[PDB]
Amino acid sequence: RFGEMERDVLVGHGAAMLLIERLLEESDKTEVWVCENCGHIALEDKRRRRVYCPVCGEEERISKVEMSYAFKLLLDELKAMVIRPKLNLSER
Amino acid sequence: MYKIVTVKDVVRIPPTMFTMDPKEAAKIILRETYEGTYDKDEGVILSILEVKDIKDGIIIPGDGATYHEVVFDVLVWEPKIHEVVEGYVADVMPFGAFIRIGPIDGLVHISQLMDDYVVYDERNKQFVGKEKKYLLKIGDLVRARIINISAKSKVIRENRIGLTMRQPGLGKFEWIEKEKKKEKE
Amino acid sequence: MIGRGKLGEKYITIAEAKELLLKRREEEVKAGIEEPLYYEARLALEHAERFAKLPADKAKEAVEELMNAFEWMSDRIACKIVDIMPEDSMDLRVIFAKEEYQPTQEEMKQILDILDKYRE
Amino acid sequence: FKYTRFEKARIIGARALQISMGAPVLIDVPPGITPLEAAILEFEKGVIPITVIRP
Amino acid sequence: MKKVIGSIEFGILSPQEIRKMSAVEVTVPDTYDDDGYPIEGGVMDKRMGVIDPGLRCETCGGRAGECPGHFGHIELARPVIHVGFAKTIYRILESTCRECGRIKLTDEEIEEYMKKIELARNRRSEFNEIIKEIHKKAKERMVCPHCGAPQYPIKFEKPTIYWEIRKDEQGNEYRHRLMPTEVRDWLEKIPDKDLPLLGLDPEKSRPEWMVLTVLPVPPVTARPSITLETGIRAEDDLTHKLVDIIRINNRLKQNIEAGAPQLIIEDLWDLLQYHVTTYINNEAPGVPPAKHKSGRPLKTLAQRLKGKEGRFRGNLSGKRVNFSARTVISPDPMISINEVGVPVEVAMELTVPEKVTEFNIERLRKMVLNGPDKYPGANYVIDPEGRRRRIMDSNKETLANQLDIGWTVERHLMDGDIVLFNRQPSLHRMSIMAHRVRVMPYRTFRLNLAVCPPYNADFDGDEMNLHVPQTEEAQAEARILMEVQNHIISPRYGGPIIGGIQDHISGGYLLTREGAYFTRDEVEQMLM
Amino acid sequence: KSSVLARAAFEITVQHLFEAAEKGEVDNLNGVIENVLIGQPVPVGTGMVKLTMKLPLR
Numbered sequence A: 001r002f003g004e005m006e007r008d009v010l011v012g013h014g015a016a017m018l019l020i021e022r023l024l025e026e027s028d029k030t031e032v033w034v035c036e037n038c039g040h041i042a043l044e045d046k047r048r049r050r051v052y053c054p055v056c057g058e059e060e061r062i063s064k065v066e067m068s069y070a071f072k073l074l075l076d077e078l079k080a081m082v083i084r085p086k087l088n089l090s091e092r
Numbered sequence B: 001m002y003k004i005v006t007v008k009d010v011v012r013i014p015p016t017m018f019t020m021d022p023k024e025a026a027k028i029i030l031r032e033t034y035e036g037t038y039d040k041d042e043g044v045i046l047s048i049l050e051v052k053d054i055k056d057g058i059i060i061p062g063d064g065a066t067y068h069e070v071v072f073d074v075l076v077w078e079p080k081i082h083e084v085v086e087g088y089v090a091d092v093m094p095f096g097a098f099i100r101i102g103p104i105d106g107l108v109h110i111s112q113l114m115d116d117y118v119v120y121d122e123r124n125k126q127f128v129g130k131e132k133k134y135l136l137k138i139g140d141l142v143r144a145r146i147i148n149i150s151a152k153s154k155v156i157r158e159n160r161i162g163l164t165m166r167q168p169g170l171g172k173f174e175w176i177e178k179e180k181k182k183e184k185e
Numbered sequence C: 001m002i003g004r005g006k007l008g009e010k011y012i013t014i015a016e017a018k019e020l021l022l023k024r025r026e027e028e029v030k031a032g033i034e035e036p037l038y039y040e041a042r043l044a045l046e047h048a049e050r051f052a053k054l055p056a057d058k059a060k061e062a063v064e065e066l067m068n069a070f071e072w073m074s075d076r077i078a079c080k081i082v083d084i085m086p087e088d089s090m091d092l093r094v095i096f097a098k099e100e101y102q103p104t105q106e107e108m109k110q111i112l113d114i115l116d117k118y119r120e
Numbered sequence D: 001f002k003y004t005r006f007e008k009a010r011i012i013g014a015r016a017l018q019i020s021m022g023a024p025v026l027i028d029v030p031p032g033i034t035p036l037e038a039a040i041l042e043f044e045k046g047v048i049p050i051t052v053i054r055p
Numbered sequence E: 001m002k003k004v005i006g007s008i009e010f011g012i013l014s015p016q017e018i019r020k021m022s023a024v025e026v027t028v029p030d031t032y033d034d035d036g037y038p039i040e041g042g043v044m045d046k047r048m049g050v051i052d053p054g055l056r057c058e059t060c061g062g063r064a065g066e067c068p069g070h071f072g073h074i075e076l077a078r079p080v081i082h083v084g085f086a087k088t089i090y091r092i093l094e095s096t097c098r099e100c101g102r103i104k105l106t107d108e109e110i111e112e113y114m115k116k117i118e119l120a121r122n123r124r125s126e127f128n129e130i131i132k133e134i135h136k137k138a139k140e141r142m143v144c145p146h147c148g149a150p151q152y153p154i155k156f157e158k159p160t161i162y163w164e165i166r167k168d169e170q171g172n173e174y175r176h177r178l179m180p181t182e183v184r185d186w187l188e189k190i191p192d193k194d195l196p197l198l199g200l201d202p203e204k205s206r207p208e209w210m211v212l213t214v215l216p217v218p219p220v221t222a223r224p225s226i227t228l229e230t231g232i233r234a235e236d237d238l239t240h241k242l243v244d245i246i247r248i249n250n251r252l253k254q255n256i257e258a259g260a261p262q263l264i265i266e267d268l269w270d271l272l273q274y275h276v277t278t279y280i281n282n283e284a285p286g287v288p289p290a291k292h293k294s295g296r297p298l299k300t301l302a303q304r305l306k307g308k309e310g311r312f313r314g315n316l317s318g319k320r321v322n323f324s325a326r327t328v329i330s331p332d333p334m335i336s337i338n339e340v341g342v343p344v345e346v347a348m349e350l351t352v353p354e355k356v357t358e359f360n361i362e363r364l365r366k367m368v369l370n371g372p373d374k375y376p377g378a379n380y381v382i383d384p385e386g387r388r389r390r391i392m393d394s395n396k397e398t399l400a401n402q403l404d405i406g407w408t409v410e411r412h413l414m415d416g417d418i419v420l421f422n423r424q425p426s427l428h429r430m431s432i433m434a435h436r437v438r439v440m441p442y443r444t445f446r447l448n449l450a451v452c453p454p455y456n457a458d459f460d461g462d463e464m465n466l467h468v469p470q471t472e473e474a475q476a477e478a479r480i481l482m483e484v485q486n487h488i489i490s491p492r493y494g495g496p497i498i499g500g501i502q503d504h505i506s507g508g509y510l511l512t513r514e515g516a517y518f519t520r521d522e523v524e525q526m527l528m
Numbered sequence F: 001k002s003s004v005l006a007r008a009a010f011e012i013t014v015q016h017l018f019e020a021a022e023k024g025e026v027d028n029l030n031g032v033i034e035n036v037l038i039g040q041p042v043p044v045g046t047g048m049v050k051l052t053m054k055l056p057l058r
């Protein structure tokens, strides 16, 4: 039903949250902890209920970023090969 | 051991608390969030004392609450290795005794009680020495020195702190006198 | 690590903590909650009461005079001094045992002097 | 200063979300209306707490 | 507490990062095991994450479905050339001295090229052209300007074989194969200052890291075992390739530690290189495609990405979105231009979630009392905790007396709700607009006639779609940004696009025609 | 197109990824396709504004 022309139209109207609501919807986006120092996916251990970046120190001001599941698997594939996808979180 | 630390953080204030002044709202949120837990790097979080400064909130799309950056100070009890501490005995096991050093109770292993053969008599809830029949009963004020701190979980009770007594110049308040009694000469 | 970053810290003695926990429990009882403090806070307050010492004001005076009259000791050793409250030379040895520095007899003589200046 | 229509849309959305979540309404409203027209009336009366930050 | 990714910078991983980022050192080529349990030191360890049900992750402690997975690393015995960077490595070798490793270029040329690169940074095509020009200039040179040592020509053999054409004491040209260790040694000596001219960044991509020393292992979620209809745990092609990699690596290591001859070490080295290349890309040029257990080429990391239906080019698509409807349209001028008529049956399915507050509690109470059959009713009610329940008739009488602030009711569509309206093919901006609902009988999307031009619609069987936004932000955006009122003037030519079409013109002419008069009855009737 | 993610869903090979990684290319996420794929608000229109509020309310 939806498609690319409709996406272009919604962009042309300037509506962005409408695009997120209509396309992404729910149960396909997830929460991922990201380190703000190096730019790697931080690890949260529920036994210790702590977040630590096992690259450049544990509590490097780790923040939380929501992303779609497909993008998470894409990042995993990119990291599987040598390419390193550093993420720079933008200040709100 | 006691300390006051100033910390900057970000606090989420739900819309239900918008009608109240931000300072006490963030204070209540911090009370509910931080008190009652142990910090691996700062010790036991005692209680939030006062919020110094608050910034204006930022609204996250998809969330009705507002997030503010606040500066506040908190009471902590942070012990360190090789630190003497005054405390009173609270409980005794076959393998040693709790020593109430504040928010948590230290334990002295039975083999490191004192420099002599020691037997345990749970009937009086105390251990028995030999050279002057040293008694380690409940309520005794000891000059115990900390030698081991095991920070494993953020739960206060789970973490263990190993503190010894056998090192020279150390004794309970009763044997502190007896220490000087042999030092009277 | 507590919070997102530590900006500063200062060491306090047993007396100021007694005062702060007293204010906490009084605010709670005026807030309608009968329970003064939680389990660990109750333990800490009970230990502080059982090992009470000089009131807060004279404790602050003692530690500030300790910094004025004794430099290389930081606030932590000052609050240790006013908490354990050494009444003798041997107490000051056992307090200052594992520390890297060791004082000369005159030094602990004057620290004992300041202690008597506040030992009521 | 004049509100661009994108800014007005975002302000209305945020205010409606807050009202739905449980925030009090700053003005009296007719009964049986959704949060959205409540926020729209709030904006029309000019009573808006939210403000925009421009670079 | 929720931030937004502002930028993504790409680079080349360093072996130290791969070592510390990973958790478990995979050493044993172990499968799912007979009892379907993760074998220690296997490809699917518990530190890699768990996808099998009824067990906990070793690293994060998460059950399958909540553990995101974790990375593991393989310690290679010998350096292996990455297939993707092979051409880059060959280009670099032709541009650097064999002894010093610096760029074979004069300082003035370096300055000029650095200025040009600084100017043309952003333009990717011009940057590539400058890089190619510098590469040609350096490769054409023979004597290093810094050392003066000869630079024997380097010949590249696809896919990952490099030959150094050296001259013997008799002048004959013989091909000397460059082992990956030699290439690494050559690459390490390159200074940082020469990287920008060489086409590299000395903070995220260093030439030594192109040759792989540690091979990371994707988590189990990234290589799941989809199982089979027979219950056989149909493995992942990546899993099989990793098993072969582990086997060959252990074999090469044990023969190395056993003082084996150089020939067998070379054989195992080349087997490892071929397996690594086919694992990264099973369709790399000059590489025989590895066959599955059924004899088909295995889908590998390269094939998992360059797919039209994969992560790239596949996530963007058009599928059946939720809360939508489609039916034919019929005209009616009795509604306002910013209104749409919705059939009752559609309105009883496309529910919208509304949170109950103090000023709308009674309306929602009546609606939930109506049930899912009366038109002003509801289909689902969500408690403040989060469970969802169907109203039905058994508990219709309750769920209303126990409904207070904090609940969520999925009521039916009612008059005044905002709704999008679309017509395909969607050419310009005005093909999607927001309308106000007006529920009427029968089954057609009633549309005012003045709104036909922007939609380019005729009532001869044309169909339209409507979507119902759910969240408050989307509803506000539709109401403020997308309403029909704001789009009277067309963005194309700056004139109106909404207006009369056929009767609105002819009847207007009849009304205003010279010599046309109306009686009192007609005047009052038409005005009303 | 500078955005390697945007170019990625327009091609048939993967060498562009390796070239971008070698060059240390930084994707600014300033476009539309990349943000849509990630699942983030597009930086156009209402995706551009930022909001702040003074909490004490009547």
Ligand SMILES: [Mg+2]
Pocket (backbone or CB within 6 Å): E457, E458, E459, E460, E461, E462
């Ligand atoms: Mg037609």
Ligand SMILES: [Zn+2]
Pocket (backbone or CB within 6 Å): A035, A036, A037, A038, A039, A040, A053, A055, A056, A057, A060
């Ligand atoms: Zn990091």
Ligand SMILES: [Zn+2]
Pocket (backbone or CB within 6 Å): E048, E049, E050, E057, E058, E059, E060, E061, E062, E067, E068, E069, E070
């Ligand atoms: Zn896990």
Ligand SMILES: [Zn+2]
Pocket (backbone or CB within 6 Å): E097, E098, E099, E100, E101, E102, E144, E145, E146, E147, E148, E149
């Ligand atoms: Zn050279």
